[PDB]
Amino acid sequence: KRITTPYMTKYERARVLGTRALQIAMCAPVMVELEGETDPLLIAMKELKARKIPIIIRRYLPDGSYEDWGVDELIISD
């Protein structure tokens, strides 16, 4: 019964990319094959293109309720 938009806003995309890059920088397992690159931020961007980020976004509503939206479920803007 989720009513928020099915598209990923730019703010959420930026924050997810940053958090995932920070996690890879701290020696975390990747969810995608590396083609010969090392920078964590590009790794996160490739990951977002591949829709394999193990993060789910909790959009809080003004009333107080919330909805858990998964990166691999909603459509990516860029």
Binding site: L61, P62, D63, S65
Partner: protein, 209 residues
Amino acid sequence: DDEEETYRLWKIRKTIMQLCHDRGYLVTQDELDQTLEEFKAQFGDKPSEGRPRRTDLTVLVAHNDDPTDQMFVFFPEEPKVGIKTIKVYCQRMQEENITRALIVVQQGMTPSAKQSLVDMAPKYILEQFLQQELLINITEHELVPEHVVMTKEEVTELLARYKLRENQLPRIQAGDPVARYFGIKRGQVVKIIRPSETAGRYITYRLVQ
């Protein structure tokens, strides 16, 4: 003046009829947009100590769905109306089961009268309108949008839909001329419809408080 006074009385009567029709009270299509010729032919067109004197042109109108609910429209002659006049009006009003009314005062009521008006509010609702404010109908102005008084059921439905508390809706004080025109009181939401240049139509809501 004689002719100007008649014109002012006719305009006030037209505005009162339009207000009653807007609120929901059933009125003739004839008297709703009656010209001034039949006004002259009806009363006598001699307001200066003649037939068309105040308190005789008063009208009582009942609501559409509730024929048992009416409202008087008085016209006291005293320029600085006191407490005795409103007292006798209320005393004569008590015979009938009517509760609402509307007072048309020449000039601003004395502050001592407003206390008595608000005192009898829970038992007999009555408000005032200066004649200078009734010479024009604001709801027809270009800036003023089309207001719709809502019912409690749809207000609750609205509040439940957006999951938003009625306290969070915008505010509008009862002193607003539109608010007194429609007779809305505290704790009541009014629909607003403005022509939106970027979205065609945009409907917002405002709670009186």
